[PDB]
Amino acid sequence: LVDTTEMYLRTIYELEEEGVTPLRARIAERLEQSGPTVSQTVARMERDGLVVVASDRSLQMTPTGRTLATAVMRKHRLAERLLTDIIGLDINKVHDEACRWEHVMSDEVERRLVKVLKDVSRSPFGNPIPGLDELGVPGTRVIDAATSMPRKVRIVQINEIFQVETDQFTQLLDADIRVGSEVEIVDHITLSHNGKDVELLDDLAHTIRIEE
Amino acid sequence: LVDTTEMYLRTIYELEEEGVTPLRARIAERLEQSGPTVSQTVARMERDGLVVVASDRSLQMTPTGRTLATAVMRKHRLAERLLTDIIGLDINKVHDEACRWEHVMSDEVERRLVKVLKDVSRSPFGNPIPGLDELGV
Ligand SMILES: [Zn+2]
Ligand SMILES: [Zn+2]
């Protein structure tokens, strides 16, 4: 999304990366925003729990704020790879372009990019591309991945150890639906594999995870 | 840029493209935004000289508003081609993504896409890509 928060978080991330203290004046100067504007925005981020102002008044991203900053930097750099590797955009405009793009590019497009690009280790500007492992390039909860139209997915985990109800244990074994098995999912959530279809119960639907 | 103005202009273009009359109520419904909100935004657009509210309370885009409406549709359609032809994004997600990208793509990227893509005549959805001539490509 085209967030001011995302802009702020990625900026804190960038400074830290450069070995710079996430001081508010550095953020403002970097974002060209004024001191009062950054404080107004930082105070808003603290309430959303994405940042915290350290002792030295430097800004520390909470785990959530950091996960977000990382996604944004991932999309940013993945965008730059597309821009130079495929599109061929003037190298002097690739960064400024990607600054907008990091805000609109979806996770799905990032995975396609990771598959279609030759090397996604670094950005054209020599910086490592973060969050790839979180992008998935374990899984997503079947119930969350469950669309009203049948889609094929690869079983990531069944969380058998966390289940209280085990009635569906043999049912999945008969349907040959195991870890690594490419099985269809939909939205009750019925997983289909080996031709057979297992209509998951609430507990398994929430727990079983599948990648893409 | 991610303008609401751009969102309104591209929506009027779309309606026109369907042979539908750009009525404030149709824009409201297409954008989901409320009637007052549309009236409020259309008012601002008029003042910027991008649209005029015609006799039948239909919205006519000034030549300026139409140049922009078209540029946006062009980036939209050029984006969709990149997503389907190169990136290989799921066809069922191409439009919504392009709906975001149309606001951020630059004219330099479009010219590059025009050069790198095999056919920029239509979008993956059969609609003709407008403004190519004005892009200078
Ligand atoms: Zn960059
Ligand atoms: Zn579209």
Give the whole-angstrom CA distance, residue A113 versus residue A80: 11
B111 touches chain A (CB under 8 A): no
> For chain A, which residues make up each domain, given as ranges?
1-71, 72-137, 138-210
Q: In terms of CATH architecture, what is A72-137?
A: Orthogonal Bundle (1.10)
Q: Which CATH class is domain A1-71?
A: mainly alpha
Asked if A101 lies within 8 A of B104 by C-beta distance, the reply is: yes
Q: Which ligand has an atom closest to residue B89 CA?
A: 2
The residue whose two tokens read 């009062």 is A36
Local structure of A13: helix, strand or coil: helix
Which tokens belong to A23? Answer: 């001081």
B56 min Cα distance to partner chain A (Å)? 36
CA nearest A155: which of A188, A189, A175, A178? A178
Taking a C-beta distance cutoff of 8 angstroms, is the pair B105, B81 a contact? no
Asked if B97 lies within 8 A of A109 by C-beta distance, the reply is: yes
Taking a C-beta distance cutoff of 8 angstroms, is the pair B30, B11 a contact? yes
B93 touches chain A (CB under 8 A): yes
B73-133 has which CATH code? 1.10.60.10
* Domain covering B1-72 assigned CATH 1.10.1060.10 in the classification: no
Give the whole-angstrom CA distance, residue B81 versus residue B100: 14
Q: What are phi and psi of A93, to 5 degrees?
A: -120, -5
CA nearest B86: which of A121, A109, A132? A109
Which tokens belong to A45? Answer: 């981020």
Taking a C-beta distance cutoff of 8 angstroms, is the pair A89, A56 a contact? no
Local structure of A59: helix, strand or coil: strand
Give the whole-angstrom CA distance, residue A99 versus residue A6: 11
Taking a C-beta distance cutoff of 8 angstroms, is the pair A50, A64 a contact? yes
Taking a C-beta distance cutoff of 8 angstroms, is the pair A144, A207 a contact? no
Spacing, Cα A59 to ligand 1 middle (Å): 22
The residue whose two tokens read 């885009």 is B61
The residue whose two tokens read 């998935």 is A136
Contacts of B83 in chain A (CB under 8 A): 109
Spacing, Cα A193 to ligand 2 middle (Å): 34
Which tokens belong to A31? Answer: 């974002």
Residue A141 pairs in a beta bridge with A209
Supply the angle between the helices A63-81 and A4-18 in degrees, to the nearest 10.
Answer: 90
Neighbours of B27 (CB within 10 A): 22
B32 touches chain A (CB under 8 A): no
A89 touches chain B (CB under 8 A): yes
Per CATH, B1-72 and B73-133 having the same topology is answered: no
A93 touches chain B (CB under 8 A): yes
Choose the closest CB to A87 out of B2, B100, B113. Answer: B113
B91 touches chain A (CB under 8 A): no
Residue B53 pairs in a beta bridge with B59
Taking a C-beta distance cutoff of 8 angstroms, is the pair A98, A76 a contact? yes
Taking a C-beta distance cutoff of 8 angstroms, is the pair B136, B111 a contact? yes
Which tokens belong to A89? Answer: 């955009």
Give the whole-angstrom CA distance, residue A145 versus residue B42: 39
Q: Which long-range contacts (CB under 8 A, 24 or more apart) does A44-51 make?
A: A44/A5, A45/A5, A45/A8, A45/A9, A48/A5, A50/A5, A50/A9, A51/A8, A51/A9, A51/A12
Element (H, E) at A91: none
A192 touches chain B (CB under 8 A): no
B50 touches chain A (CB under 8 A): no
Give the whole-angstrom CA distance, residue A65 versus residue A88: 33
> Which ranges of chain A would DSSP assign to H, the alpha helix?
4-18, 24-31, 35-47, 63-81, 94-101, 107-116, 132-135, 142-145, 169-174, 202-207
Contacts of A2 in chain B (CB under 8 A): 2
Give the whole-angstrom CA distance, residue A5 versus residue B87: 28
Contacts of A115 in chain B (CB under 8 A): 88
Asked if A87 lies within 8 A of B88 by C-beta distance, the reply is: no
Which tokens belong to A118? Answer: 């030759």
Give how far Cα B92 sits from Cα of A14, A55, A108, A186, B97, Å: 34, 49, 12, 15, 10
Q: Which long-range contacts (CB under 8 A, 24 or more apart) does A135-139 make?
A: A135/A74, A135/A107, A135/A110, A135/A111, A136/A111, A136/A211, A136/A212, A137/A110, A137/A111, A138/A209, A138/A211, A139/A209, A139/A210, A139/A211
Taking a C-beta distance cutoff of 8 angstroms, is the pair A52, A59 a contact? yes
Give the whole-angstrom CA distance, residue B81 versus residue B17: 19
Contacts of B82 in chain A (CB under 8 A): 87
A138-210 has which CATH code? 2.30.30.90
* Broken C–N links (> 2.5 Å) in chain A, after residues: 137, 187
Asked if A88 lies within 8 A of B2 by C-beta distance, the reply is: no
B120 touches chain A (CB under 8 A): no
Residues B20, B24, B25, B28, CA torsion sign:
positive
Which tokens belong to A176? Answer: 């040959």
Taking a C-beta distance cutoff of 8 angstroms, is the pair A87, B74 a contact? no
CA nearest A76: which of A93, A50, A111, A100? A100
CA nearest A124: which of A161, A82, A166? A82
Question: Chains A, B: CB contacts under 8 A, how many?
Answer: 51
Spacing, Cα A111 to ligand 1 middle (Å): 19
- Beta strand B59-61 with A182-185 is unpaired
Q: Give DSSP secondary structure letters for chain B.
A: ---HHHHHHHHHHHHHHHT---BHHHHHHHH---HHHHHHHHHHHHHTTSEEE-TTSBEEE-HHHHHHHHHHHHHHHHHHHIIIIII---TTTHHHHHHHHTTT--HHHHHHHHHHSS--SB-TTS-B---HHHHT-
Chain A's closest residue to B112, CA to CA, is A87
The residue whose two tokens read 């030759």 is A118
Give how far Cα A41 sits from Cα of A59, B70, B109, Å: 12, 35, 32
Tell me the CA end-to-end span of chain A in Å, nearest whole number: 22
